[PDB]
Amino acid sequence: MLEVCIIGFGFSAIPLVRELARTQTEFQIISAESGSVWDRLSESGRLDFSLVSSFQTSFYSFDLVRDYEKDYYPTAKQFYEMHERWRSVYEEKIIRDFVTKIENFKDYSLISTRSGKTYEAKHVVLATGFDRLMNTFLSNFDNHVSNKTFVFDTMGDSANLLIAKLIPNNNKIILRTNGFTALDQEVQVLGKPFTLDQLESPNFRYVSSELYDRLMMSPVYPRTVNPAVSYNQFPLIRRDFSWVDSKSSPPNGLIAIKYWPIDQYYYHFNDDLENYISKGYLLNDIAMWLHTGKVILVPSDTPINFDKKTITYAGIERSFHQYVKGDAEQPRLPTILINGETPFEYLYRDTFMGVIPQRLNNIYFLGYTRPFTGGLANITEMQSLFIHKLITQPQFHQKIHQNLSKRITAYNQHYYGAAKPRKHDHTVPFGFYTEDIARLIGIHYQPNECRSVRDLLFYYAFPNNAFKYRLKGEYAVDGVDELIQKVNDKHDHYAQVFVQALSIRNMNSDEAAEWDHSARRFSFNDMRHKEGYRAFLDTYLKAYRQVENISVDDTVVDEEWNFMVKEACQVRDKVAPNIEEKTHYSKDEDVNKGIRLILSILDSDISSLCKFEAQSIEFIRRLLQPKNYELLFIRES
């Protein structure tokens, strides 16, 4: 009988197949001939976009140890070509067929296929991905539509990509919204560019959930009164977060869109716009679209006449060309019968770590946990080590399953509280998930074992990418030592994000919210750095039309649209005049000061250590024994 059957091979299954081949575990893959969305987008020539996730979090450790030389955002073409390169390695192990039913029993599972062939396996892994209706909308989208009005009822990464393609052709975008969370995918720290995944320092949650809440949540929750932040200029971008009932922040279930801020897009791509646009690097600054009025937010109750294709706002019956409603992604799961009898019903919170459904036996889910920020690779690489250890080591399989129900209950209370299950429950902060899996597997690090300040920087400030836990130990990948060294040298050993915790150690949430936005350019949604890129935007729109071979008449002025923009931007026109020039930027001066201190005692032992320095050395000493380190779902009962 087959030891392992993997149903679905695209991207999530790659790191698991690598570990099974290394231990020479008997496995077989069954994946359909149709392929994935990247296959459909390749055949139609629609891989002309880039990832919302950084290279260091979007490619696997065993690829990064060879190819990493700098931080950047890969293209969809590079992402798919990596999918194809690995499929070529493992094509001999893939049966091209479609699984239609799985009958799960106490020790094995009976797998049925579309061709009629039957397979038995002791361990079954599902890595089939998700179905999304927006995928087909992207696959049939005509990029030549011009001078039309579009109404979106949902905002997301796919809607933002569609808007990025609609803006340059003089298309007007109406968002009937109940709010959305948008974050600059790259920010500046003292002028230097940082992708947002670099500044999350998740292990500071072990100090206190309140400190880490003040570290992260001011750009999400309306905590600052600073008139330069987008959620003060456009209050309809605010979401209702009354569902949050956990003390772990950012909460599980929170989703955000990652976009190019126009100032960072200009920094990277201005000197070769047409080539970068053709490569897939598209300006998608939703904050810039609201600033210029190319996108307006209207209340969700704004009346739409779907018969006449009109939307009534600002006393205007605005005709629209197309209405866009996003869907909810659902896992591509085949029919699964518990004990061969009872249909299994998927529920993320009824699985352990998104991997182990407790209603089934020896069935594992790979690729259904979504990262809040960064690429899926961080999640699926850690999931693949977790699944591999469960499959190949019976004492670990036993240790996890003996109290599986209690682990799931303890996990849900920690990350969801008393909140009822939501459709977005599968979204987790990547630095929390990778660390949780590392502690479950035993490839984690110990904060009490740091001896120098450099050790505390690596533990707390170095991002919890998958490869961070593959330097030594059971699942070490060769070359990670050089990779971690290269990453440390290019990011000043992450002292800058370490210093942020130093700077807000004695602040309350309101003081930290104001300190976050006291910078000349605060990380996310800074509306002071948009107007200065208006002329560049015109250059961008022209470069886009040349790449796409489009002729767009942008002379006819839409006085009706300008009237709706004025109605929609009343709050902006009231709060933006209150933006005041300042002589000191507290965050910049505090972070620059702390970096000087940290880099001066970088190699000193913590035991071998006039006031800011004194409270910082005390803060550094307390880091050896964090008081919020307990994670109940890690324990065996």
Q: Which helix (H) or strand (E) holds 507?
A: none
Tell me the two tokens of residue 591.
């972070």
Residue 197 vs 436, nearer CB to ligand UV3? 197
Minimum distance from residue 186 beta carbon to ligand UV3 (Å): 11
> Which stretches of the chain bind ligand UV3, using CB under 6 A?
183, 196, 199-200, 215-216, 219-220, 250, 373, 500, 516, 523
Query: Please, is 214 exposed, middle or buried when counting C-beta atoms within 10 Å of its C-beta (0-12, 13-18, 19+)?
Result: buried
Minimum distance from residue 615 beta carbon to ligand FAD (Å): 39
**What is the residue-wise DSSP string for 446-489?**
-GGG--BHHHHIIIIIS---GGGG-SSSTT--TTHHHHHHHHHH
Minimum distance from residue 66 beta carbon to ligand FAD (Å): 19
Q: Which among ligand UV3, ligand FAD, none contacts residue 373 (Cβ within 5 to 8 A by kind)?
A: ligand UV3
Q: Which among ligand UV3, ligand FAD, none contacts residue 500 (Cβ within 5 to 8 A by kind)?
A: ligand UV3
- Annotated ligand binding at 53? The verdict is yes
**What one-character DSSP code corresponds to residue 369?**
P
Minimum distance from residue 343 beta carbon to ligand FAD (Å): 16
> Which stretches of the chain bind ligand FAD, using CB under 6 A?
7-12, 30-32, 34-38, 51-53, 58, 98-99, 127-129, 132, 135, 158, 332, 334, 367, 375-376
Residue 188 vs 392, nearer CB to ligand UV3? 188
Rounded to whole angstroms, the Cα distance separating 215 from 204 reads 9
Measured in residues, the chain has a length of 637
Q: Which among ligand UV3, ligand FAD, none contacts residue 37 (Cβ within 5 to 8 A by kind)?
A: ligand FAD
Closest alpha carbon to 259 in 283, 294, 278, 235 = 283
Tell me the two tokens of residue 206.
């072990």
- Annotated ligand binding at 38? The verdict is yes
Q: Which among ligand FAD, ligand UV3, none contacts residue 99 (Cβ within 5 to 8 A by kind)?
A: ligand FAD
Rounded to whole angstroms, the Cα distance separating 424 from 288 reads 27
**What is the residue-wise DSSP string for 589-619?**
HHHHHHHHHHHHSTTSBGGG---HHHHHHHH
- Annotated ligand binding at 370? The verdict is yes
Residue 170 vs 373, nearer CB to ligand UV3? 373
Minimum distance from residue 285 beta carbon to ligand UV3 (Å): 17
Query: Please, is 184 exposed, middle or buried when counting C-beta atoms within 10 Å of its C-beta (0-12, 13-18, 19+)?
Result: buried
Closest alpha carbon to 243 in 421, 427, 429, 433 = 421
Tokens 């296959």 found at: 39
Minimum distance from residue 6 beta carbon to ligand UV3 (Å): 32
- Annotated ligand binding at 561? The verdict is no
Tell me the two tokens of residue 81.
């070509």
List phi, psi (to 5°) of 315.
65, 15
Rounded to whole angstroms, the Cα distance separating 516 from 215 reads 9
Looking at the DSSP assignment, which residues form a beta bridge with residue 6? 29, 125
Cα of first residue to Cα of last residue in the chain, in angstroms, is 33
Looking at the DSSP assignment, which residues form a beta bridge with residue 7? 30, 126
Minimum distance from residue 506 beta carbon to ligand UV3 (Å): 16
- Annotated ligand binding at 453? The verdict is no
Rounded to whole angstroms, the Cα distance separating 495 from 457 reads 7
What is the chain's Cα-based Rg?
25
Residue 31 vs 249, nearer CB to ligand UV3? 249
- Annotated ligand binding at 341? The verdict is no
Minimum distance from residue 134 beta carbon to ligand UV3 (Å): 23
Contact call for residues 146 and 550 (beta carbons, < 8 A): yes
Rounded to whole angstroms, the Cα distance separating 213 from 172 reads 37
Tell me the two tokens of residue 186.
């790259």
Q: At what angle do helices 376-392 and 430-441 cross, to 10 degrees?
A: 20
| Cα-based distances in Å from 288 to 51, 149, 207 | 19, 18, 37
**What one-character DSSP code corresponds to residue 75?**
B
Closest alpha carbon to 294 in 148, 465, 488 = 148
Rounded to whole angstroms, the Cα distance separating 423 from 418 reads 15
Q: Which among ligand UV3, ligand FAD, none contacts residue 334 (Cβ within 5 to 8 A by kind)?
A: ligand FAD
- Annotated ligand binding at 52? The verdict is yes
Minimum distance from residue 92 beta carbon to ligand FAD (Å): 17
Minimum distance from residue 49 beta carbon to ligand FAD (Å): 8
Residue 381 vs 455, nearer CB to ligand FAD? 381
Residue 256 vs 483, nearer CB to ligand UV3? 256
Minimum distance from residue 139 beta carbon to ligand FAD (Å): 9
Q: Which among ligand FAD, ligand UV3, none contacts residue 30 (Cβ within 5 to 8 A by kind)?
A: ligand FAD
Contact call for residues 435 and 202 (beta carbons, < 8 A): yes
Residue 7 vs 220, nearer CB to ligand UV3? 220
Q: Which among ligand UV3, ligand FAD, none contacts residue 215 (Cβ within 5 to 8 A by kind)?
A: ligand UV3
Rounded to whole angstroms, the Cα distance separating 119 from 368 reads 24
Residue 373 vs 412, nearer CB to ligand UV3? 373
Minimum distance from residue 1 beta carbon to ligand UV3 (Å): 46
Q: Which among ligand FAD, ligand UV3, none contacts residue 355 (Cβ within 5 to 8 A by kind)?
A: none
Rounded to whole angstroms, the Cα distance separating 3 from 22 reads 15
Q: Which among ligand FAD, ligand UV3, none contacts residue 73 (Cβ within 5 to 8 A by kind)?
A: none
Q: Which among ligand FAD, ligand UV3, none contacts residue 171 (Cβ within 5 to 8 A by kind)?
A: none
3-state secondary structure 144-181: CCCCCEEEECCCCHHHHHHHHHHHHHCCEEEEEECCCC
Residue 179 vs 250, nearer CB to ligand UV3? 250
Q: Which among ligand FAD, ligand UV3, none contacts residue 219 (Cβ within 5 to 8 A by kind)?
A: ligand UV3
Minimum distance from residue 367 beta carbon to ligand FAD (Å): 3
Residue 372 vs 540, nearer CB to ligand UV3? 372
Residue 48 vs 213, nearer CB to ligand UV3? 213
- Annotated ligand binding at 545? The verdict is no
Residue 9 vs 433, nearer CB to ligand UV3? 433
Looking at the DSSP assignment, which residues form a beta bridge with residue 316? 313
Q: Which among ligand UV3, ligand FAD, none contacts residue 443 (Cβ within 5 to 8 A by kind)?
A: none
- Annotated ligand binding at 181? The verdict is yes
- Annotated ligand binding at 139? The verdict is no
Q: 38: Cβ–Cβ under 8 A, 6 or more apart, which residues?
A: 10, 47, 76, 79, 80, 83
- Annotated ligand binding at 178? The verdict is yes
Q: Which residues are annotated as a binding site for FAD?
A: 11-12, 35, 38, 52-53, 99, 132, 332, 376
Q: Which residues are annotated as a binding site for Ca(2+)?
A: 481-482
Q: Which residues are annotated as a binding site for NADP(+)?
A: 132, 155, 158-159, 178, 181, 239, 255, 370, 424
Q: Which residues are annotated as a binding site?
A: 11-12, 35, 38, 52-53, 99, 132, 155, 158-159, 178, 181, 239, 255, 332, 370, 376, 424, 481-482
